[PDB]
């Protein structure tokens with residue numbers, strides 16, 4: 001069973017002895033710190049998961065306190081654990097955390113350098129608790145960053161799909177999550193997959209579905225979808241001389257639904273030109289528009305291989321020119337590039353297709369490690385800092401400001417998030433939100449004293465995270 | 473509760489229909505595929521997966537119904553192999569008819585060798601081998617963390633030995649700071665445990681319980697820490713009271729080591745004036761068992777470390793060790809915990825050596841660099857089918873993409889062997905059977921729902937030792 005007393009950085013166990021004496025309040029905040037491709041705005045997503053799974057309800061028991069005590073005695077070779085402080089929460093509050101958390105609504109898209117949530121203790125005895133839970137709350141960096149990076153890729157796709165086709169039809173199925181095997185754990189898989197689904201509807205990372213169902217909720221039965229597809233084992237199992245037999249068997253098994261077939265086991269160019277393009281062409285051209293063959297290269301330079309596959313297919317199948325002047329494969333045939341795709345190569349591929357006059361309608365992308373694993377907390381500088389304390393009954397605005405790195409300076413005092421007169425966002429420091437010169441604080445209480453006080457459905461989050469181009 | 477029918481990539485739900493008719497066996501293997509660095513990998517983490525996810529009754533009527541219901545909506549179609557899963561439930565009481573063979577955990581093996589193999593033990597379950605690819609492939613993560621952590625240990629060992637003449641304290645020179653910087657609680661535990669294969673210092677408490685549950689140590693815990701400040705415990709005192717914060721903290725932790733982050737406002741002032749002058753009397757009185765550890769946390773990592781050491785060296789009595797390198801007094805050390813990864817680690821220790829500072833003076837903390845900034849393509853961790861039996865005939869299968877020879881996979885039944893020179897070699901096409909290379913070094917670790925061979929964390933650590941550690945004795 002999970003024990004919140006064992007879910008912090010070891011050193012935090014010692015901090016209750018380090019704050020100034022007579023400190024009744026520690027108030028801290030989370031931001032994606034501004035830094036002097038660009039990631040200028042971030043999608044706030046994932047806190048509700050943490051609140052529900054780890055923070056709410058009776059999270060302290062006698063047994064958990066004793067367990068922590070025993071572990072820390074050996075871990076520190078010393079007795080430093082705040083057993084009294086934890087027992088207080090158990091006795092006074094039936095083990096519920098005396099903490100208030102206020103947050104911007106999930107799905108909200110906020111520029112860098114703004115407060116996204118704040119945390120403070122609601123009982124003076126628990127001044128130490130605010131930053132105890134920094135570690136667990138800061139892991140929100142991950143769904144924020146996956147959702148943000150996924151959305152930035154959607155912006156790239158949208159721009160190029162609109163340019164080459166005139167519309168955004170199918171945009172929400174253009175970047176598929178292939179990342180299940182390439183992330184660090186089962187738990188990460190569900191979190192990351194759910195964050196990508198804020199922007200798209202295609203996923204193979206099945207763990208994302210149950211997470212969304214349990215913690216967020218959707219009107220539709222499921223938040224994400226997939227279609228049948230081969231992997232190398234289901235092609236290569238037929239033997240090297242029988243690739244065509246594998247292809248034939250698979251497209252016939254899935255004759256009436258879309259099917260993707262990985263075509264690079266031995267020679268992608270041969271497979272396209274000779275196997276699909278000649279030997280099995282009759283099984284392709286007969287397919288429904290709702291059930292295309294999707295040819296999947298999976299190796300070589302991603303741009304070069306996409307362009308060469310399209311060049312080959314365009315000579316073996318009847319290509320049209322759309323109203324924008326771009327080439328379009330027949331509706332029973334598409335391509336998916338699912339190798340080496342990240343935000344940078346995604347851009348390179350669609351720009352390269354555009355240069356060669358191929359519509360983005362022809363292609364979808366799969367992304368695995370690039371989508372869910374190749375991200376860190378420093379990409380958006382997700383960071384949690386104390387900005388206000390009360391000591392001897394007096395509030396003081398606190399902050400760090402390292403001489404050699406102005407980028408790490410933190411905000412001062414009690415914070416609030418507001419709309420500016422021009423409709424942008426601003427974070428007011430030093431309790432200036434209290435002056436009421438800037439309309440209502442956009443932070444809402446989402447957790448208080450062990451209870452989740454405000455929740456968002458996955459549908460609401462998706463609405464909040466829409467692109468401007470989708471809104472237009 | 474975890475449901476293995478829902479723990480695969482969606483497309484694998486459709487694969488049972490795609491294999492050749494009358495296929496009775498699908499046999500697959502995992503390697504860290506060969507491509508100048510990461511030439512050898514530490515095999516670690518499979519035992520966790522076997523125990524937590526694969527062993528025992530993992531199929532129930534309810535889990536089958538749940539998966540049926542989810543996949544119906546996910547695919548907008550009924551493609552799920554209900555019958556196949558029911559067969560496992562009915563015939564094997566929901567235990568997986570799979571056999572997995574693996575190299576011992578902690579073993580250090582060159583790239584491009586077979587690390588584990590997987591095959592079905594019932595012909596009806598030919599589709600099961602690759603169903604569990606997704607979950608088994610996540611072993612990439614503890615393998616990669618453990619390997620990258622060990623590569624850092626090699627750097628530290630080299631420079632510690634050169635500047636001090638011994639390896640004392642090596643296993644405490646790289647501390648895990650990564651708890652907040654990983655992607656989940658589960659990842660934190662797995663990654664922290666992988667780092668503990670090589671070192672003993674961690675703040676990622678999640679790692680302790682994982683090791684105790686799945687591996688075990690003779691000692692009460694596998695890893696340790698010591699008291700330390702964070703910015704909030706300094707800055708809460710107010711900008712004009714940094715000295716008061718420092719004094720309070722070192723007085724609270726007067727007889728144990730304590731680290732105090734010193735860069736809240738001006739690291740150089742803190743070292744030269746606050747520690748070096750105002751509070752100097754509280755430092756020089758401390759025990760060798762209870763040093764103050766000064767922690768910079770910003771700026772160029774190498775430049776900041778060198779400047780902090782120059783400042784301290786002028787305020788405190790420095791000695792010259794037997795190798796000719798400068799050593800701070802034993803009540804004073806430094807920890808650099810910002811911007812540390814395998815690359816910057818190398819730059820800092822080399823820069824220190826050039827300025828004649830012993831590596832004894834310093835320890836490193838690493839967070840995202842240690843536990844998060846790693847992907848499956850670093851060591852090209854990969855699972856592939858190499859052998860099938862169809863119509864009663866075994867055939868050796870592989871991929872070999874024309875545009876990427878680095879993606880070629882191995883053929884046939886595989887085994888791992890010692891060469892005459894004592895190195896490793898992977899034999900393909902069942903050639904291990906010829907018995908020209910001795911016995912297969914893989915061991916059956918999982919069979920028909922049961923874990924059949926396992927390793928303690930102590931054994932794993934011994935297996936993962938550096939050669940330099942083995943040399944002496």
Ligand SMILES: N#C/N=C(\NCc1ccc(S(=O)(=O)c2cccc(OC(F)(F)F)c2)cc1)Nc1ccncc1
Nearest residue numbers: 176178201202204225226227229258260336364481483
């Ligand atoms: N191809 C593959 N591979 C996988 N999934 C099948 C898969 C995914 C997306 C696409 S698509 O062309 O975007 C598409 C087509 C029609 C409807 C649609 O809509 C929707 F997807 F939502 F159903 C999405 C096709 C087929 N899985 C995979 C996991 C890990 N590693 C490699 C591979």
Ligand SMILES: N#C/N=C(\NCc1ccc(S(=O)(=O)c2cccc(OC(F)(F)F)c2)cc1)Nc1ccncc1
Nearest residue numbers: 009011644647649673675696697698700729731807835
């Ligand atoms: N300084 C800090 N910060 C943290 N940990 C305390 C910490 C860690 C290592 C060291 S050391 O100098 O290597 C050391 C000293 C003596 C014995 C020893 O051995 C042993 F490790 F076993 F105690 C290790 C000191 C103090 N936590 C932290 C989490 C996340 N982000 C930033 C910070």
